[PDB]
Amino acid sequence: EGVFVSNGTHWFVTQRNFYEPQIITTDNTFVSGNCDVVIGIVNNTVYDPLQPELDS
Amino acid sequence: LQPELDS
Amino acid sequence: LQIPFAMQMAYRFNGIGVTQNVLYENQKLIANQFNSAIGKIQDSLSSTA
Numbered sequence: 447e448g449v450f451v452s453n454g455t456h457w458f459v460t461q462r463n464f465y466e467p468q469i470i471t472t473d474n475t476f477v478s479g480n481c482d483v484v485i486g487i488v489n490n491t492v493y494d495p496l497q498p499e500l501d502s
Numbered sequence: 503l504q505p506e507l508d509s
Numbered sequence: 510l511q512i513p514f515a516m517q518m519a520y521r522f523n524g525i526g527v528t529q530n531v532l533y534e535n536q537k538l539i540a541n542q543f544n545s546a547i548g549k550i551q552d553s554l555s556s557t558a
């Protein structure tokens with residue numbers, strides 16, 4: 447849901463009609479295939495919450 | 503989560 | 510509000526239940542269908558009084 451945006455130093459996702467920056471994760475994103483095809487794509491981390499919990 | 507129970 | 514046009518089309522697709530990655534994976538093909546369909550309008554209007 448919503449749009450990727452950057453403040454220059456960082457990347458966030460927000461809903462479309464009211465600015466509310468959230469960290470980008472495997473919760474608020476979905477994957478579709480490898481990087482090569484998409485025009486205008488950029489590199490960043492996308493966080494994945496489960497890792498530190500399996501490491502508990 | 504099924505494969506992660508290797509932890 | 511300005512937005513890049515290929516992102517506006519991802520919202521239009523999302524309004525008809527097609528998941529937005531289906532645009533980007535096919536962006537050049539969709540652009541060429543639209544560009545071709547516009548050409549057919551000119552020929553249709555030029556010929557068909």
Ligand SMILES: *[C@@H]1O[C@H](CO)[C@@H](O[C@@H]2O[C@H](CO)[C@@H](O)[C@H](O)[C@H]2NC(C)=O)[C@H](O)[C@H]1NC(C)=O
Binds near residue numbers: 453454456
């Ligand atoms: C982009 O957003 C990040 C996260 O809010 C900003 O980083 C924080 O900056 C403040 C000072 O403005 C610091 O107190 C925090 O410790 C920083 N946190 C992190 C996680 O780095 C960043 O400053 C913003 N950049 C711009 C240009 O607005």
Ligand SMILES: *[C@@H]1O[C@H](CO)[C@@H](O[C@@H]2O[C@H](CO)[C@@H](O)[C@H](O)[C@H]2NC(C)=O)[C@H](O)[C@H]1NC(C)=O
Binds near residue numbers: 488489
């Ligand atoms: C995003 O990261 C990838 C690596 O994970 C970058 O790909 C490499 O980029 C350098 C510099 O252009 C090339 O010399 C390598 O041959 C690239 N490797 C691959 C696997 O393609 C990629 O350029 C980054 N994207 C951007 C826009 O910076």
Ligand SMILES: *[C@@H]1O[C@H](CO)[C@@H](O)[C@H](O)[C@H]1NC(C)=O
Binds near residue numbers: 485
């Ligand atoms: C945006 O368009 C300019 C040319 O107008 C081009 O140089 C640039 O690479 C484009 N950037 C993206 C992200 O498509």
